[PDB]
Structure 1
Amino acid sequence: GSHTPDESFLCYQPDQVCCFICRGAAPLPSEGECNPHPTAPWCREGAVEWVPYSTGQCRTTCIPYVE
């Protein structure tokens, strides 16, 4: 009934991490795994788009972390 909140799932890879904010579903894990995450500065700073995903729409950004 009101504004639906968006979440974020960080898909993690031993050398790559992509954070996505979804307003209905999550990202499709095919290169590692993903789970609910807060949002570092790289998540919000590199995730500035949107795309139609399985059960909803998710946007995402990826960064070089412990790679």
Structure 2
Amino acid sequence: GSHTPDESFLCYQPDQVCCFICRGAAPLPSEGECNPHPTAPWCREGAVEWVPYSTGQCRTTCIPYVE
């Protein structure tokens, strides 16, 4: 299934969590979460997020947890 592009999305991996952002994009969620979540208690903090994506916005705040 596909996700709903709008901004920040709570992506999840079997070994890492990442917060992406965008409203007109899409290609990103496939083998893990990235749920519809405009913002969050970390996406705004400031990780290694990018500005340019394949549509207009972008982002890539990742973090290694229990993995």
Flag whether TM exceeds 0.5 (same fold).
yes
Q: Which runs of 4+ in 1 moved over 4 A?
A: 1-6
Select the structure that is richer in strand: 1
The count of corresponding residues between Structure 1 and Structure 2 is 67
TM-score (norm 1): 0.57
Is the 1:26–1:58 Cα contact (8 Å) retained in structure 2? no
Is the 1:12–1:33 Cα contact (8 Å) retained in structure 2? yes
**Considering only CA atoms, is the larger Rg found in Structure 1 or Structure 2?**
1
- What is the identity percentage for the equivalent residue pairs of Structure 1 and Structure 2? 100
Select the structure that is richer in helix: 1
Using the TM superposition, give the Cα deviation of residue 65 of structure 1 relative to its aligned residue in structure 2, in angstroms: 3.2
Q: Is there any run of 5+ residues in structure 2 with no aligned partner, and where?
A: none
TM-score (norm 2): 0.57
